[PDB]
Symmetry: D2
């Protein structure tokens, strides 16, 4: 549960910057802007309340470029293999 | 992308890390997994060069925590976000 | 890649963040910058749709800090690494 | 300055896993394996000393996919524009 205050925001393009009530670190948010049941609200303004739920990224893949660079970061929903012996 | 099949370059199933060559594209993938993606059962490593399959999803909803020094202090899934109405 | 020219979608030069459409490829880019990449001089925003240039480098040498809960707790540049000899 | 101990390592492929002497978080390292002046040392083993220098990633670009996903993370060496007015 993350509660905080808008520093700046671009809801239409799905990103923003928030100061959480807890900890000492601000957060840049990116999200799919769209619909999930309620009518659209105004792009929030500096000082407005914002809430979200966050979860650790414990299951992921990092794609590595031919040059060794960071070429993507995905969620790993599942993985399977046949164990040796 | 959804389904990702490939072959194992290296694996450490005890610690939940692996390195895979996908059958598609030119980029290898490091994986970090828990029981969430791999299941509860204790499973030993696959052999290098054997098959491995997964399911992947783009991370579209995320937070980057920014440190006092301005660095990347954390990367999280943003499960839901809401704000006050104007 | 080196040189990256593009056009501004949105910008916040006061806080060191921006969003750019590169002239090359199909992917937009969010940038986070300090005086290290942007210079000391106070500069106001460019206009939306104007040109912007940068220089980029792949991050090949890095550390991912893993939290007690197994998450991504930090991402850093690894400037040098060494280990004991066998 | 980061000092720590090898948990596992693959020097030839340029990655590893370290427990730093400081803090409560382990670190997965990726690096370009190659030459920078000295002769090659053995892949380190569990319990071996490892050292490195780390720096915050303060100047970066994140590439966003057509689907909104994380499609790359680069270092931003510089950036320039003509300020409006």
């Amino acid at each position: 549960k993350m509660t905080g205050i808008v520093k700046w925001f671009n809801a239409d393009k799905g990103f923003g910057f928030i100061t959480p009530d807890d900890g000492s670190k601000d957060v840049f948010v990116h999200f799919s802007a769209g619909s999930s049941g309620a009518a659209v609200r105004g792009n929030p303004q500096q000082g407005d309340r914002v809430e979200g739920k966050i979860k650790s990224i414990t299951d992921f893949g990092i794609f590595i470029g031919l040059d060794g660079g960071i070429d993507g970061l995905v969620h790993l929903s599942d993985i399977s293999w046949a164990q040796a012996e």
